[PDB]
């Protein structure tokens, strides 16, 4: 069953991976309404597609800046992977294209805003609430890892809540297709596995570590390793000593000791039973994995939605006009985009 599902999913992925889609829309098909988020190379805007009237999130990246910052591979990875995957808790790329100056990735608009804002607003999530989202991530990494994909940037800021209270994973900026070890120092300091920080070379297990950090943060309201600066954080991480809030259940603590495990021969997700170690853990005993996959479980939280184009679930950012040069820039670097 899951075996069967995963093998067909891999055929589907490989077809698209091998022959990615390209140039399916163009800038003037969309009216830009508001910035939803920014980044190193550009920004993410709420846009409206003129002919359908549907709203989308348009991720905009300055080609020149991408080359300068040595992020070509990561950016090509992001698009190539996002266009080939398909899973209920992954955001959908609807269109992509490029112009003289920029790269564009147009995704389904997920209006519920980031998990991050809801988490900080409410303080922390109850274990059933945290457990509902964690199951989604477990299934998602099982899918991704089966395609040889490492996600590498799990955090509440990259998880969006949809109109049904379900998670949409966004930001494939550090996602990578690889069998074996890889070495890039990337992610978010609070979430880095010890093996990333010690520059040992690492594999998919870092995603499972990050899950433990995420479950901790959701349940505690704060991360297991925090400080004012990255350096300090890496010290606590490699220390590995973790303390748990008084309200954590015994099962939760046991699960987290297994995920936040410095020893890779012992970290859950990484053993002989693989993910099943996680799925069959006591803390997940009330979880209906199929129902979750099917999105038939009632969500604990359903974002308020003041209609199409509503961005009240997002913070406001300062806007700036999108420049497109009359000169093509970096054409060769981004030929495959």
């Amino acid at each position: 069953s899951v075996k069967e599902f995963l093998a067909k999913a891999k055929e589907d992925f490989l077809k698209k991976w091998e022959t990615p889609s390209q140039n399916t829309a163009q800038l003037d098909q969309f009216d830009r309404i508001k910035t939803l988020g920014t980044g190193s190379f550009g920004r993410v805007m709420l846009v409206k597609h003129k002919e359908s009237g549907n709203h989308y999130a348009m991720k905009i990246l300055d080609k020149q800046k991408v080359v300068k910052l040595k992020q070509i591979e990561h950016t090509l990875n992001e698009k190539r992977i996002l266009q080939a995957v398909n899973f209920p808790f992954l955001v959908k790329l609807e269109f992509s294209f490029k112009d003289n100056s920029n790269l564009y990735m147009v995704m389904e608009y997920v209006a519920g805003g980031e998990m991050f804002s809801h988490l900080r607003r409410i303080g922390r999530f109850s274990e059933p609430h945290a457990r509902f989202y964690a199951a989604q991530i477990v299934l998602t990494f099982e899918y991704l890892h089966s395609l040889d994909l490492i996600y590498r940037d799990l955090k509440p800021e990259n998880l969006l809540i949809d109109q049904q209270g379900y998670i949409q994973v966004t930001d494939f900026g550090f996602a990578k297709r690889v069998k074996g070890r890889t070495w890039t120092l990337c992610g978010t300091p609070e979430y880095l596995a010890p093996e990333i920080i010690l520059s040992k070379g690492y594999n998919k297990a870092v995603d499972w570590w990050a899950l433990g950090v995420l479950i901790y943060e959701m349940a505690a309201g704060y991360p297991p390793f925090f400080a004012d600066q990255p350096i300090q954080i890496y010290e606590k991480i490699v220390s590995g000593k973790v303390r748990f809030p008084s309200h954590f259940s015994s099962d939760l603590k046991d699960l987290l000791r297994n995920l936040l495990q410095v020893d890779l021969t012992k970290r859950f997700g990484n053993l002989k039973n693989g993910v099943n170690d996680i799925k069959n853990h006591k803390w997940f005993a009330t979880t209906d994995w199929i129902a979750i996959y099917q999105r038939k479980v009632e969500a604990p939280f359903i974002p308020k939605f003041k209609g199409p184009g509503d961005t009240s679930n997002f913070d406001d950012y300062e806007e700036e006009e999108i420049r497109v040069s009359i000169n093509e820039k970096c054409g060769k670097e981004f030929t495959e985009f």
Binding site: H74, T188, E190, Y222, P223, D228
Partner: peptide
Amino acid sequence: TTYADFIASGRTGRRASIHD
């Protein structure tokens, strides 16, 4: 408390990704 110390810290807002 741990919460009070976290909440008083400089990293309670959106966290930026880092790379090589």
